[PDB]
Curated annotation (Swiss-Prot), chains A, B:
Membrane side Extracellular: residue ranges: 1-88
Cysteine-cysteine disulfides: 43-77, 44-62
Mod. after translation: Not glycosylated. Likely constitutively palmitoylated at low levels. Protein palmitoylation is up-regulated upon coligation of BCR and CD9-C2R-CD81 complexes in lipid rafts.
Outcome, altering residue 31 to E: Reduces binding to integrin
Subunit comment: Homodimer. Part of a complex composed of CD19, CR2/CD21, CD81 and IFITM1/CD225 in the membrane of mature B cells. Interacts (via the second extracellular domain) with CD19; this interaction is initiated early during biosynthesis in the ER and enables trafficking of only properly folded CD19. Part of a complex that includes MHC class II/HLA-DR molecules and IFITM1. Interacts with IFITM1. Interacts with IFITM2 and IFITM3. Part of integrin-tetraspanin complex composed of CD9, CD81, beta-1 and beta-2 integrins in the membrane of monocyte/macrophages.
Effect of mutating residue 13 to A: No effect on integrin binding
Residues shown, of full length: 114 to 201 of 236
Tissue: Expressed on B cells (at protein level). Expressed in hepatocytes (at protein level). Expressed in monocytes/macrophages (at protein level). Expressed on both naive and memory CD4-positive T cells (at protein level).
Record organism: Homo sapiens (Human)
Phenotypic consequence of residue 83 to K/Q/R: Strongly reduced affinity for HCV protein E2
The protein's name: CD81 antigen
Domain of life: Eukaryota
Homology family: Belongs to the tetraspanin (TM4SF) family.
Length: 88, 88
């Protein structure tokens, strides 16, 4: 199993869940998945940019106790998924 | 991008790294990957059984501060990967 490919597939999966969670306040599976990724990886977006908007607009999805400020200087979720499969 | 499939692929990736890490004291990439999965997911094996032996024989691969005792009653890494993609 190629690490790059699987990392890509997981980031792809996370992006889809993130999209569903922010647009549809009723897509509760997506919300749970996103929240679990965020709590597990200590991040709140696919990019610094989307982490910012998420933290401002829907901070319930971000790691507990996280701020806009913190969520703006954290690694994004793509980097953290990368770190997971690379062993960093 | 099916959750079941990606979960399976990640568990398969994790299993490959775990195998490499325990048998080959020189496979340093594998050790790093395993340690990062374990620290991130708070687990130490593919099963309760392998978590036990890992925690006994190579506890350096387990989450920091974890005991054999704890590592024997934690969720295994497959369950935790499951929880990650299901949103638990």
């Amino acid at each position: 199993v190629n690490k790059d490919q699987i990392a890509k597939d997981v980031k792809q999966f996370y992006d889809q869940a993130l999209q569903q969670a922010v647009v549809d306040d009723d897509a509760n599976n997506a919300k749970a998945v996103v929240k679990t990724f965020h709590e597990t990886l200590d991040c709140c977006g696919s990019s610094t940019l989307t982490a910012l908007t998420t933290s401002v607009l829907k901070n319930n999805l971000c790691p507990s106790g996280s701020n806009i400020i913190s969520n703006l200087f954290k690694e994004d979720c793509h980097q953290k998924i990368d770190d997971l499969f690379s062993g960093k």
